């Protein structure tokens, strides 16, 4: 339900400096960064499909396959005689 | 007491904590809970490793 943040009308109140980074903020930053990257490498900003994110995901999936096979053969060496 | 009861109480305690260590109350992000849960999950890594070594011991001669 409630989501708001009215304007503070008190001059003697508290002002919240030194903000952190929210999950929302970091997601928005990652999005705008992927959008700039798309607009630079390609000439798309409509972002209907992002092949760059797919490529990065592909390389990281390769890395995950790597580390998974590694730990798998490791525990295989240990458990088996 | 309900799940909502204990959830509300733990949250308002955490908000008091964010109100004396940090100096915000918005609780948009709660780094205090982040660090506390980090120490806890360290202990959890320890306990899972301990029982892992336990079973690993039971297998080998």
């Amino acid at each position: 339900f409630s989501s708001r943040t009215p304007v503070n009308e008190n001059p003697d109140g508290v002002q919240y400096r030194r903000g952190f980074v929210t999950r929302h903020q970091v997601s928005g930053w990652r999005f705008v960064m992927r959008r700039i990257a798309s607009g630079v490498a390609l000439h798309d900003t409509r972002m209907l499909v992002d092949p760059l994110r797919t490529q990065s995901r592909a390389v990281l999936t390769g890395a995950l396959i790597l580390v998974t096979g590694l730990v798998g053969c490791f525990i295989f060496s240990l458990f088996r005689p | 007491v309900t799940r909502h009861q204990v959830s509300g109480w733990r949250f308002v305690m955490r908000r008091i904590a964010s109100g004396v260590a940090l100096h915000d109350t918005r609780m948009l992000v709660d780094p205090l809970r982040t660090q506390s849960r980090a120490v806890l999950t360290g202990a959890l890594i320890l306990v899972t490793g301990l029982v892992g070594c336990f079973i690993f011991s039971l297998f080998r001669p």
Partner: protein
């Protein structure tokens, strides 16, 4: 449960800022009432000033 935690976090931030706002409203009212009704020890400085008999039947 993060659902309701974020819900109450949003509501409580909204509540903190509206608390600050209503406290500003209250302090404004109080400053007005103290401008109108000063402490008696102040009354010795009122006379012979632009504000000496200020209240008129529209106030």
């Amino acid at each position: 449960t993060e659902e309701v935690d974020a819900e109450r976090a949003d509501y409580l931030r909204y509540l903190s800022v509206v608390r600050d706002n209503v406290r500003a409203h209250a302090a404004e009212q109080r400053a007005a009432l103290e401008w109108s009704h000063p402490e008696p020890e102040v009354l010795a400085t009122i006379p012979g000033t632009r504000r000496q008999w200020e209240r008129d039947p529209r106030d």
